Amino acid sequence: SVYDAAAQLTADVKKDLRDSWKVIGSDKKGNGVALMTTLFADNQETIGYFKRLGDVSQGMANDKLRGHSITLMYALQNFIDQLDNPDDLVCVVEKVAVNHITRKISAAEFGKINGPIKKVLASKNFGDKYANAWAKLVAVVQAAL
C-alpha cells in the first residue's frame, strides 16, 4: 500500500520536490512555523491535537510551537533525502506514521496539511505543479495511516 503510493513519485515529481525543497527547507524555522500557523488558521479544529503546545496564537514566540515546527521540517528533510531509494523512503514514512496512528490521526485529517503547504509554496512563488508534487508525498504517509 505504502509501496504503491510511492510508485506515484515519478522522476518529474521527485525533481519538483527536491527543487522546491531547496528553498522551503533553507528556512526550517520560518517556513515550518508558517506551515503550522496556516494549518491552525484554515483548520481551527486541528488545534485540538496540540493542547500540549499551549497558546499557539503566539506563533514563533511560542517555544513549544517553534520547537515542534522545526522538528517537523526535519521529517520532510528525511523524506526528501530518501526519494531515490523506495525501500528507505517506506521504512521512514512508516516510522513517522506510528506516532500519528497512536494519536488517532486519520488519513483525511492528515491531508489537511496540503492547504498550508500549497500556500507556503506560493509565498515562495511555486505554482500548482509543485503543490501537486507535494500532495503526492503526503499521500505516501496517508497510505500508512
Binding residues for heme b: 100
Site membership for ligand HEM, residue 76 (CB under 6 A): yes
Distances (CA, A) of 86 to 15, 19, 46, 132: 15, 19, 30, 19
CA distance 127 to 144: 27
Task: Assess contact for 143 and 2: CB atoms under 8 A.
Answer: yes
Scan residues 15-44 and list those touching its own copies (CB under 8 A).
Answer: 28-29
Q: 95 or 129, CB closer to its own copies?
A: 95
Q: Which among 65, 43, 61 has a CA at the least distance from the CA of 53?
A: 65
The secondary structure of residue 85, as a DSSP letter, is -
Phi-psi region of 55 (alpha: psi -120 to 50; beta: other; left: phi over 0): beta
Residue 131 CB, nearest approach to ligand HEM (Å): 13
Site membership for its own copies, residue 55 (CB under 8 A): no
Among 56, 105, 107, 145, binds ligand HEM (CB under 6 A): 105
Residue 132 CB, nearest approach to its own copies (Å): 26
Q: 23 or 75, CB closer to its own copies?
A: 75
Interface residues with ligand HEM (CB under 6 A) are: 46, 49-50, 52-53, 68, 71-72, 75-76, 96, 98-100, 103, 105, 109-110, 112-113, 138
